[PDB]
Design a protein around this ligand. Structure first.
Ligand SMILES: [Zn+2]
Ligand SMILES: [Zn+2]
Lengths: 10, 10
């Protein structure tokens, strides 16, 4: 995965 | 964390 996948936030 | 931190190995 990538940074966007590893990092989550809504 | 970064790609290097998220992932492991060579
Ligand atoms: Zn990654
Ligand atoms: Zn990251």
């Amino acid at each position: 995965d990538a940074e966007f996948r590893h990092h989550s936030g809504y």
